[PDB]
Scaffold this active site. Structure first.
Site, PDB file in Angstrom:
ATOM      1  N   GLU A  64      -4.609   3.795 -10.931  1.00  0.00           N
ATOM      2  CA  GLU A  64      -5.395   2.580 -10.720  1.00  0.00           C
ATOM      3  C   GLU A  64      -6.517   2.491 -11.788  1.00  0.00           C
ATOM      4  OE1 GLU A  64      -6.188   1.378  -6.463  1.00  0.00           O
ATOM      5  OE2 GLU A  64      -5.752   3.537  -6.126  1.00  0.00           O
ATOM      6  N   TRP A 123      -9.293   6.448  -1.133  1.00  0.00           N
ATOM      7  CA  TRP A 123      -9.575   7.162  -2.365  1.00  0.00           C
ATOM      8  C   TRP A 123      -8.529   6.729  -3.384  1.00  0.00           C
ATOM      9  CZ3 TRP A 123      -8.426  10.027   2.180  1.00  0.00           C
ATOM     10  CH2 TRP A 123      -7.089  10.461   2.295  1.00  0.00           C
ATOM     11  N   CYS A 173       0.799  -1.211   0.000  1.00  0.00           N
ATOM     12  CA  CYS A 173       0.000   0.000   0.000  1.00  0.00           C
ATOM     13  C   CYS A 173       0.836   1.266   0.000  1.00  0.00           C
ATOM     14  CB  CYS A 173      -1.003   0.005   1.154  1.00  0.00           C
ATOM     15  SG  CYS A 173      -1.990   1.509   1.218  1.00  0.00           S
ATOM     16  N   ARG A 203      -0.093   4.686   2.770  1.00  0.00           N
ATOM     17  CA  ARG A 203      -0.020   4.462   4.211  1.00  0.00           C
ATOM     18  C   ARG A 203       0.336   5.686   5.071  1.00  0.00           C
ATOM     19  NH1 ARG A 203       3.701  -0.566   4.829  1.00  0.00           N
ATOM     20  NH2 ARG A 203       4.297  -0.024   2.671  1.00  0.00           N
TER      21      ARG A 203
HETATM   22  C1  HEM Z   1      -6.393   6.420   1.495  1.00  0.00           C
HETATM   23  C2  HEM Z   1      -5.890   6.358   0.261  1.00  0.00           C
HETATM   24  C3  HEM Z   1      -5.288   5.037  -0.268  1.00  0.00           C
HETATM   25  C4  HEM Z   1      -4.563   4.955  -1.379  1.00  0.00           C
HETATM   26  C5  HEM Z   1      -4.181   6.117  -2.347  1.00  0.00           C
HETATM   27  C6  HEM Z   1      -4.200   3.567  -1.544  1.00  0.00           C
HETATM   28  C7  HEM Z   1      -3.459   3.093  -2.592  1.00  0.00           C
HETATM   29  C8  HEM Z   1      -3.203   1.778  -2.852  1.00  0.00           C
HETATM   30  C9  HEM Z   1      -2.700   1.240  -4.081  1.00  0.00           C
HETATM   31  C10 HEM Z   1      -2.341   2.053  -5.360  1.00  0.00           C
HETATM   32  C11 HEM Z   1      -2.570  -0.080  -3.900  1.00  0.00           C
HETATM   33  C12 HEM Z   1      -2.037  -1.128  -4.911  1.00  0.00           C
HETATM   34  C13 HEM Z   1      -3.173  -2.044  -5.363  1.00  0.00           C
HETATM   35  C14 HEM Z   1      -3.336  -2.085  -6.861  1.00  0.00           C
HETATM   36  O1  HEM Z   1      -2.727  -1.267  -7.619  1.00  0.00           O
HETATM   37  O2  HEM Z   1      -4.106  -2.980  -7.290  1.00  0.00           O
HETATM   38  C15 HEM Z   1      -3.007  -0.422  -2.570  1.00  0.00           C
HETATM   39  C16 HEM Z   1      -3.025  -1.686  -2.021  1.00  0.00           C
HETATM   40  C17 HEM Z   1      -3.477  -2.015  -0.765  1.00  0.00           C
HETATM   41  N1  HEM Z   1      -3.988  -1.134   0.173  1.00  0.00           N
HETATM   42 FE1  HEM Z   1      -4.020   0.970   0.007  1.00  0.00          FE
HETATM   43  N2  HEM Z   1      -4.708   2.808  -0.504  1.00  0.00           N
HETATM   44  C18 HEM Z   1      -5.389   3.687   0.314  1.00  0.00           C
HETATM   45  C19 HEM Z   1      -6.075   3.314   1.443  1.00  0.00           C
HETATM   46  C20 HEM Z   1      -6.036   2.081   2.050  1.00  0.00           C
HETATM   47  C21 HEM Z   1      -6.766   1.692   3.243  1.00  0.00           C
HETATM   48  C22 HEM Z   1      -7.733   2.601   4.038  1.00  0.00           C
HETATM   49  C23 HEM Z   1      -6.448   0.425   3.517  1.00  0.00           C
HETATM   50  C24 HEM Z   1      -6.965  -0.427   4.699  1.00  0.00           C
HETATM   51  C25 HEM Z   1      -7.395   0.212   5.805  1.00  0.00           C
HETATM   52  C26 HEM Z   1      -5.538  -0.032   2.484  1.00  0.00           C
HETATM   53  C27 HEM Z   1      -4.934  -1.268   2.424  1.00  0.00           C
HETATM   54  C28 HEM Z   1      -4.356  -1.812   1.318  1.00  0.00           C
HETATM   55  C29 HEM Z   1      -4.081  -3.228   1.166  1.00  0.00           C
HETATM   56  C30 HEM Z   1      -4.315  -4.369   2.201  1.00  0.00           C
HETATM   57  C31 HEM Z   1      -3.491  -3.338  -0.216  1.00  0.00           C
HETATM   58  C32 HEM Z   1      -3.043  -4.640  -0.896  1.00  0.00           C
HETATM   59  C33 HEM Z   1      -4.192  -4.995  -1.850  1.00  0.00           C
HETATM   60  C34 HEM Z   1      -3.877  -6.304  -2.508  1.00  0.00           C
HETATM   61  O3  HEM Z   1      -2.839  -6.933  -2.121  1.00  0.00           O
HETATM   62  O4  HEM Z   1      -4.638  -6.728  -3.417  1.00  0.00           O
HETATM   63  N3  HEM Z   1      -5.329   0.993   1.594  1.00  0.00           N
HETATM   64  N4  HEM Z   1      -3.395   0.742  -1.952  1.00  0.00           N
HETATM   65  C1  LIG Z   2      -8.597   0.952   0.023  1.00  0.00           C
HETATM   66  C2  LIG Z   2      -7.927   1.047  -1.326  1.00  0.00           C
HETATM   67  C3  LIG Z   2      -7.672   2.314  -1.850  1.00  0.00           C
HETATM   68  C4  LIG Z   2      -7.045   2.393  -3.099  1.00  0.00           C
HETATM   69  N1  LIG Z   2      -6.773   3.595  -3.646  1.00  0.00           N
HETATM   70  N2  LIG Z   2      -6.714   1.273  -3.780  1.00  0.00           N
HETATM   71  C5  LIG Z   2      -6.943   0.012  -3.317  1.00  0.00           C
HETATM   72  C6  LIG Z   2      -6.477  -1.169  -4.200  1.00  0.00           C
HETATM   73  C7  LIG Z   2      -7.385  -2.364  -4.537  1.00  0.00           C
HETATM   74  C8  LIG Z   2      -7.246  -3.396  -3.417  1.00  0.00           C
HETATM   75  N3  LIG Z   2      -6.613  -4.580  -3.969  1.00  0.00           N
HETATM   76  C9  LIG Z   2      -6.123  -4.346  -5.304  1.00  0.00           C
HETATM   77  C10 LIG Z   2      -6.981  -3.173  -5.773  1.00  0.00           C
HETATM   78  N4  LIG Z   2      -8.107  -3.785  -6.452  1.00  0.00           N
HETATM   79  C11 LIG Z   2      -7.892  -4.535  -7.691  1.00  0.00           C
HETATM   80  C12 LIG Z   2      -8.220  -6.026  -7.621  1.00  0.00           C
HETATM   81  N5  LIG Z   2      -7.030  -6.853  -7.560  1.00  0.00           N
HETATM   82  C13 LIG Z   2      -6.819  -7.779  -6.462  1.00  0.00           C
HETATM   83  C14 LIG Z   2      -5.329  -8.015  -6.263  1.00  0.00           C
HETATM   84  C15 LIG Z   2      -4.932  -9.447  -6.549  1.00  0.00           C
HETATM   85  C16 LIG Z   2      -5.374 -10.121  -7.696  1.00  0.00           C
HETATM   86  C17 LIG Z   2      -4.988 -11.445  -7.923  1.00  0.00           C
HETATM   87  C18 LIG Z   2      -4.151 -12.098  -7.014  1.00  0.00           C
HETATM   88  C19 LIG Z   2      -3.708 -11.417  -5.876  1.00  0.00           C
HETATM   89  F1  LIG Z   2      -2.905 -12.027  -4.989  1.00  0.00           F
HETATM   90  C20 LIG Z   2      -4.094 -10.097  -5.647  1.00  0.00           C
HETATM   91  C21 LIG Z   2      -7.552  -0.100  -2.050  1.00  0.00           C
END
Ligand code: HEM
Ligand SMILES: Cc1cc(N)nc(C[C@@H]2CNC[C@H]2NCCNCCc2cccc(F)c2)c1
Ligand code: HEM
Ligand SMILES: Cc1cc(N)nc(C[C@@H]2CNC[C@H]2NCCNCCc2cccc(F)c2)c1
Ligand SMILES: C[C@H](O)[C@H](O)[C@H]1CNc2nc(N)[nH]c(=O)c2N1
Ligand SMILES: C[C@H](O)[C@H](O)[C@H]1CNc2nc(N)[nH]c(=O)c2N1
Ligand SMILES: [Zn+2]
Lengths: 411, 407
Positions: A285, A280, A108, A111
């Site tokens: 994305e 947000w 993420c 953070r």
């Molecule tokens: C507040 C603005 C936030 C932004 C700009 C943001 C941005 C991102 C981005 C760009 C990714 C990469 C996922 C992708 O490209 O598919 C990501 C992943 C992730 N975020 Fe954040 N996020 C935000 C908030 C949060 C919040 C509130 C949480 C949980 C409380 C969170 C938890 C995670 C987790 C667990 C992943 C891994 C997702 C996955 O492995 O599929 N994010 N986030």
């Molecule tokens: C809360 C929040 C804010 C934000 N700006 N952005 C996000 C990213 C979402 C979450 N997680 C990926 C993004 N959503 C895309 C869906 N992909 C799932 C990721 C994936 C697929 C296949 C295998 C594997 F292990 C993982 C979350």
């Protein structure tokens, strides 16, 4: 063990000690790196040590480590585990846990914001209807008429693994995908299988390019039930371009609230299998991944045509050219409608400040370079040049298998 | 044991078993991934030699043949007596091609078997090295029709008799610190430039001054040499749409040629082994031109394009980045100097991975390095899981000689 990481652009060197607290495994070994692999019922025996580590962490954070209050909580949780095979988190511990799971989320980039998370305790929920209500409130609170606020809603924890709460949607708000007999897809190809389950569950599909999917919600291990989110709760942004007036005619829109609903939140050994959270968007994305992945809406060609780019040779960089324009459009459209969004330059710059702060105050910041570096313009962002260390801390968000794969249908 | 890698765009799944033949360590552990870290005797030599000869003899389908066993005895004997041994020409060519084949950070490996190997093990002096290098440069450049090549100088002995090229690449531009405080030319080469001046080079003090070669033979102090200008093919950078582009004064050299690495074959260490191929466009247009710590021309280009530079969210950096990279490819192409764009290189690498999985059982690959520095997710490699591991023969990094050399 002190580990150094260097930024090759600024020469700033940081020292990691936090990785010493890391318990879980990465998938790598001394002979293989699995850094680019997407995915590399607890007993009494295992549960008390997990609870203890967690409570020690928590009581240290509030500066009450070793206090009577600390010791009494440990003994009360121990007593509760021996008596009931599980335990309940205090509200304060739950909030701390959810915040730390985000803080620990190595993939993420957002953070910097970890300590501002609105936590909605939904552990008193018993039914899918109750789930639907909690989720509507989450969406309304989080959306905040375009001034987005981070939030998570936490449904009751796993018990025997036969009584799971699950949100079957991978995100709270997403568009339907429909596979046509000619092999083409209408809407979002990423959501075809789930769209099919909804239809089978009785959803009446409008069959358009951006139909907001219904929620499919499972409480207490029961069969999931369908609910339509009130449309007035779904904020959407029509996509246009500041200079190209034909861009509006592509008919693109996207929703404002990214809300992950398929992950498992682990806190002190307890497993919260339904814990939808939202923030947000970072522009890429939508503009890079959702619009331009070949497996998603796949608009590159169409945009390139409309720009009259030379599409004969890849070496004209026509794809790169259209890509940038699309991402300009996404950012411009969100800003003009006053919906919170962050560009990849700003988000990555903030992440570097966050990471440096974390090393100074916490001893480190686990980070997954493969995921943190944006999917366009990698090296013009400061994260590309930042060495990172990936390791797993708890509390944590974890992947879990799709519920249609594991669920026991009752009928 | 058996490991699967999936491509998320195509759903193609490959199975890796080649990793089971890995000897060297990654930097990673079960508890920590170091995937984004840039740099993570008689008895010792014999298993290494044997490991290498066994793979050699199996490659030509003679594993356990008389020629195989006979060579293993001959090498065992030479080691037992000299404490080192000598590769046959065939082994040296095989070891070189396979070090490239095994380079997990290299996207251009589809080409691994068409490497021209120049055996310079008979070299004894810096002038001899200079001659070998000019010949390598001229052969590789081939009037713009670039051919991959490596020149291999004598292997390390006691480690006080090392052959080294002090340059990081055969061809690079000077960097000078200025009274202004800013940097003229390439800031990556400021320290090397000062050593050249310290050694006696008369710097022209311009923006694109080809550095002299600083060559060390047999552990001796290194010597300066200017590469004949006529041997250094350069490309003036212009834009197919933008007339004004040419007036930024930009050019780059056609031949990318790494000269600071160490080639390890069967425990033998070749500390001077300059190798060269041809550029992927982004190496110049994204990294050389746009890194903040390199030529850093984004601000200037965005200015000429009259873009809105007030907010990062206008993506002025990103727009200008693309145009710069279009210009680089257009210029090389117009001049018939071999170059590959990132789309075509990454498509070829996916084809190569597939070849390697079916023919060899795997392909070690470092995703952090393979994915281009722009437009990552619109290239097929972005969506490709890769397994990174270390096979030998290999290219390895080594200390910069100045931090080491006893004068
Ligand atoms: C507040 C603005 C936030 C932004 C700009 C943001 C941005 C991102 C981005 C760009 C990714 C990469 C996922 C992708 O490209 O598919 C990501 C992943 C992730 N975020 Fe954040 N996020 C935000 C908030 C949060 C919040 C509130 C949480 C949980 C409380 C969170 C938890 C995670 C987790 C667990 C992943 C891994 C997702 C996955 O492995 O599929 N994010 N986030
Ligand atoms: C809360 C929040 C804010 C934000 N700006 N952005 C996000 C990213 C979402 C979450 N997680 C990926 C993004 N959503 C895309 C869906 N992909 C799932 C990721 C994936 C697929 C296949 C295998 C594997 F292990 C993982 C979350
Ligand atoms: C034929 C065209 C070639 C192309 C397009 C190509 C492409 C690349 C690229 C893009 C990189 C990443 C380097 C960076 O970003 O700095 C790289 C690294 C590397 N290449 Fe290749 N290459 C080619 C030929 C070769 C040859 C002939 C060899 C050796 C015989 C080689 C060995 C290596 C090694 C060892 C690395 C990693 C070195 C480092 O860590 O800096 N390459 N290559
Ligand atoms: C043969 C060949 C062909 C080609 N197209 N491309 C190449 C990559 C060159 C070599 N190696 C990097 C690229 N040249 C860029 C210079 N950067 C040095 C990398 C570096 C800096 C600091 C620390 C560190 F560990 C590594 C080789
Ligand atoms: C194979 C590879 O690990 C995979 O495509 C990853 C790469 N980096 C990513 N980074 C983000 N933020 N999101 C992703 O889905 C991916 N996909
Ligand atoms: C810190 C990080 O590992 C570093 O910036 C790497 C990332 N990926 C790279 N990839 C390539 N091809 N070349 C590089 O120099 C780098 N630099
Ligand atoms: Zn690793």
């Amino acid at each position: 063990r002190f580990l150094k990481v260097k930024n090759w652009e600024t020469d700033v060197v940081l020292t990691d000690t936090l990785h010493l607290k890391s318990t879980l495994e990465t998938g790598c070994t001394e002979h293989i790196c699995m850094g680019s692999i997407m995915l590399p019922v607890a007993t009494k025996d295992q549960l008390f040590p997990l609870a203890k580590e967690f409570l020690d962490q928590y009581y240290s954070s509030i500066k009450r480590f070793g206090s009577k209050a600390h010791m009494d909580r440990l003994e009360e949780v121990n007593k509760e585990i021996e008596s009931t095979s599980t335990y309940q988190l205090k509200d304060t511990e739950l909030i701390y846990g959810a915040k730390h799971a985000w803080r620990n989320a190595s993939r993420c980039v957002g953070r910097i914001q970890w300590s501002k998370l609105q936590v909605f305790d939904a552990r008193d929920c018993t039914t899918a209807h109750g789930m639907f209500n909690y989720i509507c409130n989450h969406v309304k609170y989080a959306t905040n008429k375009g001034n987005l606020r981070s939030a998570i809603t936490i449904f009751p924890q796993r018990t025997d693994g036969k009584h799971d709460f699950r949100v079957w949607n991978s995100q709270l708000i997403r568009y339907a995908g429909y596979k046509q007999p000619d092999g083409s897809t209408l809407g979002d190809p990423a959501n075809v299988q789930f769209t099919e389950i909804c239809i089978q569950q009785g959803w009446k599909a409008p069959r358009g390019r951006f139909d907001v999917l219904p929620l499919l919600l499972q409480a207490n291990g029961n069969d999931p039930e369908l609910f339509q989110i009130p449309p007035e709760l779904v904020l959407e942004v029509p996509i246009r371009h500041p200079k190209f007036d034909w861009f509006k005619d592509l008919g693109l829109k996207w929703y404002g609230l990214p809300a992950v609903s398929n992950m498992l939140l682990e806190i002190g050994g307890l497993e919260f299998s339904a814990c939808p959270f939202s923030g947000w968007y970072m522009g890429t994305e939508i503009g890079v991944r959702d619009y331009c992945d070949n497996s998603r809406y796949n608009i590159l060609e169409e945009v390139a045509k409309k720009m009259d780019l030379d599409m004969r040779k890849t070496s004209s960089l026509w794809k790169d050219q259209a890509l940038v324009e699309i991402n300009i459009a996404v950012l411009y459209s969100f800003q003009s409608d006053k919906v919170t969004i962050v560009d990849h330059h700003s988000a990555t710059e903030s992440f570097i400040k966050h990471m440096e702060n974390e090393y100074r105050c916490r001893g480190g910041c686990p980070a997954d370079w493969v995921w943190i570096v944006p999917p366009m313009s990698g090296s013009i962002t400061p994260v590309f040049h930042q060495e990172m260390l990936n390791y797993r801390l708890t509390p944590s968000f974890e992947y879990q298998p799709d519920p249609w794969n594991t669920h026991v249908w009752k009928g």
